[PDB]
Amino acid sequence: PQRVAQEMQKEIALILQREIKDPRLGMMTTVSGVEMSRDLAYAKVYVTFLNDKDEDAVKAGIKALQEASGFIRSLLGKAMRLRIVPELTFFYD
Numbered sequence: 001p002q003r004v005a006q007e008m009q010k011e012i013a014l015i016l017q018r019e020i021k022d023p024r025l026g027m028m029t030t031v032s033g034v035e036m037s038r039d040l041a042y043a044k045v046y047v048t049f050l051n052d053k054d055e056d057a058v059k060a061g062i063k064a065l066q067e068a069s070g071f072i073r074s075l076l077g078k079a080m081r082l083r084i085v086p087e088l089t090f091f092y093d
Contacts, residue, residue: 001036008034011079012045015072016065025061026050032093036086043086046093058092065090 013031016022022029028050035044047065051057065072069088077085 005034005036007080008036008043008076011076012072015075015079016047019071019075020065020068029061040084040086043088045088045090047090048093062090062092 009031012034016029016031017027026049030048031045032048033046035046037043047062049058049061051061066089069090073085073088076082076088
């Protein structure tokens with residue numbers, strides 16, 4: 001799904017700024033891509049940081065973002081009026 005992956009990159013990048021304080025990460029955490037399941041039960045999200053100045057802070061940043069993943073899924077479905085939204089898993093790129 002090439003077009004849904006482009007809409008998800010854009011809206012998830014905004015929800016990453018709104019649903020958690022991205023100023024705590026320097027207000028420049030960006031989405032580089034998504035990777036989606038054939039059955040849409042799951043998706044992987046790839047993220048690139050200005051908080052990249054510390055490897056231990058990026059590890060903690062992904063850990064804090066994964067704890068918020070259920071809000072991010074619920075909001076992504078609301079922003080798209082989507083019939084099903086995938087369950088979300090986050091990665092540093």
